[PDB]
């Protein structure tokens, strides 16, 4: 979907506050992919670093961007199958030990010589009451603190 991609590109070309008081393009690449990785895993890291998810239509491949979208389908009791036990919908919650409020993002800083660097981002109000869970991540094409 070159059309979908074009929208996505326009979005990640937006000007956003840099973090050192300047402006900056929202997302940009600057990778140097230097191993054989599985095609789908690579494609997913692209479409994760720019907020979307890759959708194999079955026919084509598009990108559904993680945004408030219109065209919301509706499902109630009269619509989904009713099994023998009267449970149309089953919910299941992520574990508290899996909800994170701090992350170490790894990017490649040109300014201190092009080596890995980590910016820690936390949610203070969340840490204040729900303890303090940290994880890691690598932003995919990242060479800016802002990004």
């Amino acid at each position: 979907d070159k059309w979908a991609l074009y929208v996505i590109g326009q979005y990640c070309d937006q000007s956003v506050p840099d973090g050192f008081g300047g402006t900056e393009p929202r997302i940009t690449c600057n990778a140097y992919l230097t191993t054989q990785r599985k095609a789908w895993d690579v494609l997913s890291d692209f479409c994760s670093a720019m907020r979307c998810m890759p959708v194999w239509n079955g026919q084509t491949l598009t990108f559904v961007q993680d945004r408030p979208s219109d065209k919301t389908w509706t499902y109630n009791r009269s619509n989904v199958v009713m099994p023998d036990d009267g449970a149309p919908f089953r919910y299941s919650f992520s574990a508290l030990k899996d909800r994170h409020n701090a992350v170490e993002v790894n990017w490649i800083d040109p300014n201190n010589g092009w080596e890995t660097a980590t910016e820690l981002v936390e949610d203070t109000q969340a840490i204040a009451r729900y303890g303090r869970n940290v994880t890691k991540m690598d932003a995919f094409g990242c060479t800016s603190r802002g990004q």
Binding site: V16, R51, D66, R67, P68
Partner: peptide, 16 residues
Amino acid sequence: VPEKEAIVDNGAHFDG
């Protein structure tokens, strides 16, 4: 949770 783009790139206020 639609009002999430707002919360991340605007620092906007949403209540839990």
